[PDB]
Design a protein around this ligand. Structure first.
Ligand SMILES: Nc1ncnc2c1ncn2[C@@H]1O[C@H](COP(=O)(O)OP(=O)(O)O)[C@@H](O)[C@H]1O
Ligand SMILES: Nc1ncnc2c1ncn2[C@@H]1O[C@H](COP(=O)(O)OP(=O)(O)O)[C@@H](O)[C@H]1O
Lengths: 91, 116, 324
């Protein structure tokens, strides 16, 4: 069931307040991003290890010092994996 | 340097608010918490959104993109806002999983979170 | 079938058959990275991103349409520079580049003749032969593998295939490379006259004009005696302009070759008596982009290029530089 409007209670506002639940803690598998792996320039620097089929399609991000956005996701193409890394402006 | 999602600091529902507003500014649509009689349930930090895909909107095709967000406490005071793709579906028929436009949308979202 | 040049004859036959029976998909590693730029990135940024990620090329994404927007390679820069040198009476006009977004660089090229009107690529599930024919129909030395997600109509850039990685693939997968035992000087292959050559004294922009005019990816540097010393590659141009110093173009080749990081695929040489069997082996274990053919005393005789080799196996028996 979708919706277009900001839930009201998140403007009460807002300390006071319910003393609402925490989100769950970070599970161990999002601790590591395969992009940080370049075992491979020996000699094909594009090779990554096999991903982990839980983490297909999760956005990852990275600091550039260049004033653009670094984004990436991993996906199955037929039986092979493509991690695409996008460099993109903000405007 | 690479890590999943986008980092967040501060107050958990303060961040939940910002994400909600950020969706609203992109024109995404979203699920919303529903309490247990009381009483807000921890899954409120699980947001399913739906995004009209602009270049399909340009044809005038009704094709949508499904994106799930999830908050996780990392340290005390530090959070990962995790973003994952549930795929695309047009209102019609009749089996690739591209990262696009999923990545172009996370790009939009991130612009909204920051221009806030 | 049972002697050199009749054994080679047959061996080539298997190799093309091998080529046709595979797809571009098949060449790809089972899990790899692909770096993609927004077409609206500024030129300086994109240069900084190639170097930092250690790449010489990247496919462009037109993100509003979700469409592949061209392939960015050192050729784009080599062609714009040539143009400015041949046309502008103003040496500092070249500096202007830095203001361009990749999209506006591509328009200048479009307007200037330097780019094809529609936009070369292949389906990754089609035949590997498809990839070669195209890369040899245009003299492009790499090609995008593009598919389409029918749920969105958006395009899916799967990979970019280089000539080098096709040949490596062939070297590792075809036993029959070892049966190509015919010396180069018997076959008809490579270029053996009218070499574009340069010396240390030569100016970089003259080397760049040679590169654009002959649609060649590299230029050998020789001494007065014509011994081979080194090479100046279109990828070398990237290292001179990376900091916005477009005056590094007036450097002599020698000066510019000192600014080169170690890193450098090296320069590969063979004798004229060398055969294709050994070369596929050099390829199997090392990153060769071309072979200079030399004599006892390192004197240049000719050039055996990757296109050259691909073209020899795939076929049955002044302006502008293509994607590099
Ligand atoms: N756009 C890109 N994204 C990711 N990796 C790339 C890209 N372009 C080149 N590479 C990688 O850089 C390395 C050097 O390749 P390159 O110089 O482009 O051609 P070649 O395939 O002849 O080595 C290879 O491991 C290749 O996979
Ligand atoms: N310096 C040169 N002079 C004349 N012809 C060349 C030169 N370098 C390469 N060629 C030839 O021109 C064509 C361009 O090949 P290409 O793959 O661009 O060469 P490379 O990548 O080694 O610079 C090929 O037929 C090649 O044999």
């Amino acid at each position: 069931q979708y919706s277009t409007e900001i839930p009201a209670f998140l403007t009460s506002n807002t300390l006071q307040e319910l003393k609402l639940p925490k989100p769950p803690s970070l599970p161990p598998h999002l601790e590591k991003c395969i992009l940080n792996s370049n075992t491979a320039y020996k000699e094909d620097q594009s090779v990554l290890p096999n991903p982990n089929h839980v983490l297909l399609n999760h956005l990852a991000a990275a600091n550039t010092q260049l004033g653009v956005l670094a984004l990436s996701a991993t996906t199955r193409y037929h039986r092979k994996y493509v991690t695409t890394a996008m460099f993109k402006n903000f405007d | 340097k690479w890590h999943f999602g986008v980092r967040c600091r501060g107050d958990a529902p303060e961040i939940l608010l910002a994400v909600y507003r950020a969706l609203q500014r992109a024109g995404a649509q979203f699920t919303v918490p529903k309490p247990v009689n009381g009483k807000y349930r921890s899954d409120m930090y699980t947001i399913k959104s739906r995004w009209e895909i602009p270049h399909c909107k340009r044809e005038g095709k009704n094709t949508y993109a499904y994106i799930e967000l999830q908050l996780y406490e990392v340290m005390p005071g530090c959070f990962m806002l995790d973003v994952k793709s549930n795929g695309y579906k047009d209102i019609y028929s009749h089996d690739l999983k591209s990262s696009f436009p999923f990545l172009d949308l996370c790009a939009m979202l991130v612009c909204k979170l920051f221009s806030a | 079938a049972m002697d050199v040049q009749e054994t080679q004859k047959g061996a080539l036959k298997e190799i093309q058959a091998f080529i046709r029976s595979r797809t571009s998909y098949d060449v790809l590693p089972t899990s790899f990275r692909l770096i993609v730029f927004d077409v609206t990135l500024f030129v300086k940024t994109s240069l900084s991103l190639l170097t930092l990620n250690n790449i010489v090329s990247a496919p462009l994404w037109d993100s509003e349409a979700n469409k592949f927007a061209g392939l960015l390679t050192m050729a784009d820069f080599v062609n714009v520079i040539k143009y400015y040198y041949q046309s502008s009476s103003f040496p500092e006009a070249i500096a202007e580049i830095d203001k361009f977004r990749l999209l506006g660089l591509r328009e200048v090229e479009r307007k200037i003749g330097a780019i094809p009107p529609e936009t070369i690529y292949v389906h990754p599930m089609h035949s590997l032969m498809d990839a070669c024919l195209a890369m040899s129909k245009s003299r492009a030395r790499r090609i995008p593998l593009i598919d389409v997600d029918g749920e969105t109509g958006s395009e899916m850039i799967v990979s970019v295939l280089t000539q080098y990685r096709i040949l490596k693939f062939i070297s590792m997968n075809c036993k029959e490379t070892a049966m190509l035992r015919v010396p180069l000087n018997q076959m008809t292959i490579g270029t053996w006259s009218n070499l574009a050559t340069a010396s240390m004294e030569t100016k970089v922009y003259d080397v760049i004009k040679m590169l654009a005019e002959k649609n060649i990816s590299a230029v050998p540097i020789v001494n007065s005696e014509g011994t081979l010393l080194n090479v100046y590659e279109s990828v070398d141009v990237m290292h001179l302009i990376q900091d916005g110093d477009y005056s590094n173009l007036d450097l002599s080749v020698g000066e510019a070759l000192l600014k080169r990081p170690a890193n450098f695929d090296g320069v590969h040489t063979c004798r004229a008596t060398d055969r294709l069997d050994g070369i596929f082996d050099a390829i199997k274990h090392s990153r060769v982009h071309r072979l200079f053919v030399v004599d006892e005393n390192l004197k240049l005789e000719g050039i055996l290029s990757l296109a050259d080799i691909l073209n020899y196996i795939i076929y049955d028996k002044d302006n502008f530089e293509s994607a590099v």
